[PDB]
Write a protein that binds this ligand. Structure first.
Ligand SMILES: [Zn+2]
Ligand SMILES: [Zn+2]
Lengths: 48, 114
């Protein structure tokens, strides 16, 4: 009871801004995915 | 090696030993007809299957549009750049990833492996 009635003041939500990250974080993620795909390509070429 | 057939009745030859003489011959039981054998081997069994698939794979697969093709590896006899490559299909070998290559030109049936 008491903590719901306090949450009436602060409130809670979820939205798009909660799921959008920074442009530098996006660049880091893309770079990681690129090196990972390049590594898998190298492994495939080694097996070939 | 493999089957040979009798001339008199087109049936299987199978081997018999000339008991008095110690020479092997092939005799079709459905008749009297006989052959002193050239094949001094009667049965061979390639247990480990070390054989490369070059005879099984065939030039017409070069016409498959869903196969990949690279300019990197040239053919030996003609040296046309385009050559389609694909994996093995032998189920039972010490290896399972080697690439078989076929020359892509309409008039050069040639094949290799790496
Ligand atoms: Zn016969
Ligand atoms: Zn060729």
């Amino acid at each position: 009871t008491v903590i719901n009635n306090w949450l009436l003041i602060e409130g809670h939500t979820i939205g798009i801004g909660d799921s959008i990250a920074d442009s530098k974080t996006y660049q880091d993620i893309q770079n990681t995915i690129k090196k990972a795909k390049q590594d898998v390509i190298e492994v495939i070429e080694k097996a070939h | 090696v493999g089957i040979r057939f009798c001339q008199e009745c087109n049936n299987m030859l199978y081997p018999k030993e000339d008991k008095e003489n110690r020479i092997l011959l092939y005799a079709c039981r459905n008749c009297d007809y006989q052959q002193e054998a050239d094949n001094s081997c009667i049965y061979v069994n390639k247990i480990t299957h070390e054989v490369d698939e070059l005879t099984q794979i065939i030039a017409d697969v070069s016409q498959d549009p869903t196969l990949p093709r690279t300019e990197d590896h040239p053919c030996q006899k003609c040296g046309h750049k385009e050559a389609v490559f694909f994996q093995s299909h032998s189920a039972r070998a010490e290896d399972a990833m080697r690439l078989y290559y076929v020359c892509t030109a309409p008039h050069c049936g040639h094949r290799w492996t790496e």
